[PDB]
Design a protein around this ligand. Structure first.
Ligand SMILES: Nc1ncnc2c1ncn2[C@@H]1O[C@H](COP(=O)(O)OP(=O)(O)O)[C@@H](O)[C@H]1O
Ligand SMILES: [Cl-]
Ligand SMILES: [Cl-]
Lengths: 564, 586
């Protein structure tokens, strides 16, 4: 037969052999049944195949020829224990729910398993029964609600390496350990230096914090090519990475540095990282832009930056020094993927849904977030958390600045449109590229690294008007169509939505409908700015009032940037 | 409890509930253990969780309290059937391996399953009793001869099994393949995407009928490049496409260079049919229409779908430029704003009647040719220019490498492209005459060379196109794909610089997904070495030793009545080009 290890690797979606038996015991019928069913739902919800043995599938099948004689009851428990063992051997978490009153029979069931090196967890649901003398768990089901009870079981299974403690992709930070920093800064001081700009420093941050795991630094030619042609890294496994994470260089700088085994990156006169074992390769700007954006339009605001950069790229192993902070009053929201994962744990989340943003949050956005939350509750998640995740790297000139967005978002939560108790507000450090279906994959994969389990996507993600025509640069359905089928995003689920707009009839935000076109008022950023300058407000229900007020303040400051 | 649909979604990596029981039955020694183990291994290897119930886990555990009385034997099988049903309900493929001699016992096991809406497949592992005794795999038969079903008890043959395996007339692969094909027919095992040649021609015995059908349909007129794409699909070069790309396939192609549904398949160039707003409105809603070339109905497109031809974006992603003066891009920019995907049934076999159809072999014809030559390796060389001795050097050195590895009959597929090419390229007829001359001179050996024309339009899309060139030759049975510098490249129409970095084609090919049955054989540029007086691999140090002879230079030599240096091109092949150049100047 195939080994447990091989059988393990195909059983579930999660990898590793985790066969075992969770053996409930105790008088309480409702207590065992509520715990077994809730545990089963939890396991299935977290990608772990399981199967329950109870009265409803054993009594009238395998044990249909057994009655209430002492010998028949003994045989009843024996048969159940042997079948539980076969499920555990198969790689499933087998849950059994029978009173199983006698120590002898339970101890025998245990030996059937431990004898075959299969974990056995005796769980006493405590509400001529013989109490277990050393159960792995005691559940006081009359005094603790079902969800606490199930959490006690999940914790045991985590303890015993059955349920993964954290089943997102391991984050690879590129920061030097803090006890090695002073030495690493001293080392950096002896190296040649290459001055970088602010956008470059933001990409240093993206790498440092692990958002581009498993990169070891700025992309080498091999990674750059896999990215541009396939939207994935390929070496050692397929993982989505659809945008170049590169450092540019002029011909002059390449000539100065090619040959060095290491150099420092310098931002605002400070040495912020070391690049080791560098490799210099051609940028090829037109080809990059065409493949990455689906256009080479010179007035696209990110492409404009790329076009002014040098003709070389430098790949290498990046060691970033001092933790990157910007000291602008928003560092409190700049959580790393590791910090986000600890936050979700502290909140006891059992699902994390992520929402990428570069604009003010209106109640159309909120609709997608609210309906996601409802969908997760209905699927069996008990404590879903929303990761409201505005982007905070470079953005284009007419976007609403980050500080104003963060103030607006704070007003939306203050008004209760989103619940602050089940929402984490954090800033994603990447520059924004405005590359539509190519970029949405990057936005999604970054959140995956940070432990998101569900990624919300709507219409025209990461898009903008074509600078020459004013028509949409990208077809507005493509971002969700591409993301739903994109390779290398296996630890999360994409949750796609139709566009939401203000429905004049219902006086609220709702999903757009082809028939009923005229019932819908679409309100853009341009239109918001126009309304504000004439002292008007969008329709009631489009945006939380306090959050609209923040925007009037922004628009007033823009107007100021006079007769009296 | 959680439903079957939901528990199924987390059982394994493939979507969908596929719980069921595969119930082997037959005489001791007929082959049940052997089949079950080999079936188990197949399933695990293809990502499908399964579990086997046999003597090694049932007998000494659950059934340890059962002996040999008839009542106990009946209980043995009843308990195994109940356990199997639990495994199948759990979403596993449960395989059972027990003699299970009695019809009533096996019928009861079936009924337990079918009553709970779980599929049950009764597989009769059928070998003659004398054969099973002959094998006597565990020594049970000669132990029964001295003091058992088939001897002192009866075996009752299944009356309507789902499958019968005649193990004395087939091998283990035959058994596993029969079981797997049943599980595929019954939607338990998915049929994964394959490179096995898939022609879209209608079978000859159905053609007249299909032509009749086509006449009743609305029609769309296509151009010659589109007809060449029809030929590419018809012959199977774009296997496993079922027709012109639907939106889902087009988006996969553009963003990922791969089709992904059912497995990773390399397909890096759109294979699409275009249409105007007017044709879209005429045809949208129809369930099938005919494609017309030169007034003939050449194909039916069934169940079509219309989606936007975002031309700027397509061109940018496919070519890595939107330059309007790129000669293929120029054609794309003149097409309609819609694409039409669908299932393509191609009618009469495509021939061009230009004196070169003898070279226009299909992938199936090519594989038959290699078989007839008893080749044990095939290397392929894609060309769009005349063959000089620099190309021959790559070919000859590949043949050497294959002999050194131990292949005994390596065959070269010299495979010029014959679909649309840009205006200043040497026309196909002249190239084919020129290639014939190279073989006549013995620069390449005619006895170990297949010359054939690849029907694809040429796109001049560099590292994106070279994947298409390579995968197309893989489908036609190439085991080795020869690649040089700047494959499928050309100069930028505006700047004059190379469009592509010359090493990227080879670099991309060596890591491209889906290129599973061939090896890439990469080479440096080969040029005329003046010092050594022959074609040789270019070297930076020693740059002054090399004469590059371009198309431009050859035209000039021909004009002035001169020849390239000795050893650059076989003399008779050069003469063919002097005839070409003569007509060109006119
Ligand atoms: N096509 C075949 N399928 C299965 N076994 C075969 C086949 N052909 C020959 N055999 C041989 O027949 C014997 C079957 O033994 P086994 O599988 O243990 O029988 P069973 O489990 O029915 O008692 C093996 O030695 C096997 O190699
Ligand atoms: Cl966005
Ligand atoms: Cl070529």
């Amino acid at each position: 037969h195939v080994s447990r290890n091989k059988r393990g690797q195909v059983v579930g979606t999660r990898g590793g052999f985790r066969g075992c038996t969770v053996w409930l015991t105790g008088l309480s019928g409702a207590g065992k049944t509520t715990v077994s069913m809730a545990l089963e739902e939890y396991l299935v919800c977290h990608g772990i195949p399981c199967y329950t043995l109870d009265g409803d599938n054993i009594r009238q099948g395998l044990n249909k020829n057994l009655g209430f004689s002492p010998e028949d009851r003994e045989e009843n428990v024996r048969r159940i224990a042997e079948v539980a063992k076969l499920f555990a051997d198969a790689g499933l978490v087998c849950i059994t729910s029978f009173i199983s009153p006698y120590t002898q029979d339970r101890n025998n069931a245990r030996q059937i398993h431990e004898g075959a090196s299969l974990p056995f967890f005796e769980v006493f649901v405590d509400a001529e029964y013989e109490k277990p003398e050393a159960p792995e768990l005691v559940l006081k089901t009359d005094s603790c609600d079902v969800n606490d009870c199930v959490q006690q079981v999940v914790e045991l299974l985590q303890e015993r390496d059955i349920v993964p403690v954290d089943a997102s992709y391991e984050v690879k930070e590129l920061y030097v350990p803090e006890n090695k920093l002073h030495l690493a800064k001293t080392d950096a001081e002896t190296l040649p230096a290459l001055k970088i700009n602010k956008v470059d420093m933001q990409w240093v941050q993206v790498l440092a914090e692990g958002w581009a795991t498993p990169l070891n630094g700025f992309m080498r030619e091999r990674e750059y090519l896999q990215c541009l042609h396939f939207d994935c890294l390929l070496d050692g496994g397929v993982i989505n990475l659809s945008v170049p994470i590169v450092l540019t260089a002029t011909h002059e700088d390449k000539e100065r540095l090619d040959g060095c085994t290491a150099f420092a990156l310098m931002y605002e006169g400070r040495r912020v990282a070391i690049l080791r074992n560098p490799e210099f390769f051609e940028h090829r700007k037109e080809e990059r832009c065409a493949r990455q954006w689906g256009t080479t339009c010179k007035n696209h605001p990110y492409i404009k930056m790329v076009m002014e950069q040098g003709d070389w790229l430098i790949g290498g192993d990046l060691q970033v020094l001092d933790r990157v902070y910007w000291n602008d009053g928003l560092d409190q929201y700049r959580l790393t993927p590791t910090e986000l994962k600890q936050k979700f744990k502290d909140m006891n989340a059992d699902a994390v849904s992520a929402f990428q943003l570069r604009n003010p949050v209106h109640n159309g956005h909120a609709l997608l977030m609210q309906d996601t939350h409802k969908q997760l509750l209905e699927r069996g998640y008990r404590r879903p958390v929303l990761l409201l995740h505005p982007l905070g790297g470079w953005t284009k000139d007419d976007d609403v600045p980050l500080m104003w967005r963060m103030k607006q978002h704070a007003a939306v939560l203050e008004e209760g449109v989103l619940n602050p108790e089940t929402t984490v507000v954090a800033i994603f450090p990447s520059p924004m590229m405005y590359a539509g279906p190519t970029e949405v994959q990057w936005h999604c994969r970054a959140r995956m690294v940070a432990g998101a389990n569900f990624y919300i996507v709507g219409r025209d993600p990461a898009g903008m008007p074509h600078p020459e025509t004013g028509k949409d640069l990208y077809e507005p359905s493509h971002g969700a169509k591409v993301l739903t089928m994109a390779p290398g995003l296996i630890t999360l689920e994409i949750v796609p939505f139709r566009v939401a707009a203000y429905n004049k009839k219902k006086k609220r935000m709702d999903y757009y409908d082809s028939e009923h076109h005229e019932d819908f008022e679409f309100i853009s950023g341009t239109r918001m700015r126009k309304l504000a300058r004439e002292g008007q407000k969008p329709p009631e229900g489009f945006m939380a009032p306090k959050a609209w007020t923040v925007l009037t303040e922004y628009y007033k400051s823009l107007e100021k940037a006079h007769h009296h």
